[PDB]
Structures are given as C-alpha cells and as structure tokens.
Curated annotation (Swiss-Prot):
The modification Phosphotyrosine is found at Y159, Y189. Induction: Reduced expression in metastatic osteosarcomas compared to primary osteosarcoma tumors. Down-regulated in both breast (43% of tissue samples) and ovarian (25% of tissue samples) cancers. It comes from the Eukaryota. Interacts with EVL and VASP and targets them to the leading edge. Interacts (via Ras associating and PH domains) with RAC1. Coiled coil: none annotated. The chain holds residues 268 to 518 of 1250 of the full protein. This is Ras-associated and pleckstrin homology domains-containing protein 1. Isoform RMO1-RAPH1 is ubiquitously expressed with highest levels in brain, heart, ovary and developing embryo. Isoform RMO1 is widely expressed with highest levels in liver. Low expression in B-cells. Residues 2-88 form the Ras-associating domain. Mediator of localized membrane signals. Implicated in the regulation of lamellipodial dynamics. Negatively regulates cell adhesion. It comes from Homo sapiens. Residues 129-238 form the PH domain. It is found in: Cell membrane; Cell projection, Lamellipodium; Cell projection, Filopodium; Cytoplasm, Cytoskeleton. Belongs to the MRL family.
Length: 251
C-alpha cells in the first residue's frame, strides 16, 4: 500500500508534513493530525482543500479517500490542504431542526427530538430530504454578470427555470445532476466575479482544476440561504453516509 507525504496548513498559517497511505479516509488522516498536534479531540476538526485556480474551498467529507482526491490535482497544483476547526461541517447534525424543516426561521429543539428527526431523514430505506426552493443568483457563462433565477433541489439534482426570475414549476429543467459534482464555498467572489454578495457556492466535477464553463456559480441573499443550500446539496449527494460520518466523529 503506497505511502504519500502531504503538506498541511495549520490554523496559524504554519505548515506540517505527514505521511498518509492510499487506503486512508479523511477521518483517519484527521485522527492523526489531532494526535500529532495535541490540539485535543473534536468532531469539528476538518480538512479543507482550496482550489487555487478558482479561489474556492471545500471541507472534505470524512469518509473520503484522501489520496484519491489528491490525484485530481494538476501536477503543478497550488491547491492547499488546511487543518482547522470548521463548525459548518456538522452544524446540520447539531441543529437539524434548522435545515430539515425550513422554515428559514431559526429555533431550538430538544436533543432527543434532534435524534428522532435525523433517524427519520437518514435511516429509512432511503434518505428523505425536504426540498429547498428559493431565488438565487447565477453567474453568466464566462462573464462577470449575474441573474436571479428560481431553484429547486430534488433528490435527482438541482433544477431551475431559465425563463425570468420567478417560480414557474412546469418550466423546471435540469440545472445540474449531483453524482459527479462536489460543492465548494467561493472566497471573496464579491471582487473576483462581481458577485452581488459574498455568500457563494460552486459546483464542479472533482477533475476540473482551472477555468471552465462547466463550473456553476451561485450567489445567495444571506448566510442562512447559503447554509441551507450547501447542506441540502450535501444530503442529496452523500445521503446516509453523512450521518454515519457524524455518528463516527462524535467520540
């Protein structure tokens, strides 16, 4: 089993090398990062990749084979790995009442009922995602201009209406199937793409590493809409496996 030394940027901009092997999940790699750094355990420690050509980043899911993802990088990639606490990773699981009923409206829930609610959504014969709908900005292909379109998340991918800026259901066409796209956060898209706000998500194939028309750029009204959409997209991509990651992480 092949070994690889990766370089990881820590929370204070310093960097460390460490050996990983081709069988390891991100979870296993993070467990090592935690041991060697003496940072103390927590389900919120995360491994984050930047895609340098495209100024965006994602938190890997813990079940993912690290080495396999890294092979997607170009030979001369300036992508970085970053080891930092990210609350975004398990927010959804800590407070599911805020994502799985929506109800953008934010609220408490008793622990035991959080538990029931995740069981209902993730543990049946299939994942029962509640659908996310709302207007969002879509960057024009290869241009720094945006347009409001209405969006709808089904278990079968993202859909949208290409005509106008309103909810017209019969005119929902495939916007993007999720099987072979990861979802990222864009960094400072306000400036780089003249985004209407900074609350931006990006969908692309793992293998695309530079400018491409097949990269989809979305901008949200506020940080809540951003969170709901990213979590929703994550459920519909990864399903019950997200739940298993959380259960496993929560030592």
């Amino acid at each position: 089993v092949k070994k690889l030394v990766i370089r990881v940027h820590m929370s204070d901009d310093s960097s460390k090398t460490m050996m990983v092997d081709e069988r390891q999940t991100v979870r296993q790699v993070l467990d090592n990062l935690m041991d060697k750094s003496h940072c103390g355990y927590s389900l919120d420690w995360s491994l984050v990749e930047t895609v340098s050509e495209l100024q965006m980043e994602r938190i890997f899911e813990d079940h993912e084979n690290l080495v396999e993802n890294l092979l997607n990088w170009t030979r001369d990639s300036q992508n970085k790995l970053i080891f930092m606490e990210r609350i975004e990773k398990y927010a959804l699981f800590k407070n599911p009442q805020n994502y799985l009923l929506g109800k953008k409206e934010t609220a408490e829930m008793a622990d035991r009922n959080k538990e029931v609610l995740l069981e209902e959504c993730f543990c049946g014969s299939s994942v029962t995602v509640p659908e996310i709908e709302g207007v969002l900005w879509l960057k024009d292909d290869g241009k720094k201009s945006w347009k409001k379109r209405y969006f709808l998340l089904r278990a079968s991918g993202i859909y949208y209406v290409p005509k106008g800026k309103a909810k017209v259901s019969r005119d929902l066409v495939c916007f993007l199937q999720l099987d072979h796209v990861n979802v990222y956060y864009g960094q400072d898209y306000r400036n780089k793409y003249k985004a209407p706000t900074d609350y931006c998500l990006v969908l692309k194939h793992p293998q695309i590493q530079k400018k491409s028309q097949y990269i989809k750029y979305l901008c949200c009204d506020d940080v809540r809409t951003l969170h709901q959409w990213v979590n929703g997209i994550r459920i519909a991509k990864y399903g019950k496996q997200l739940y298993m990651n959380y259960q496993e992480a929560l030592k």
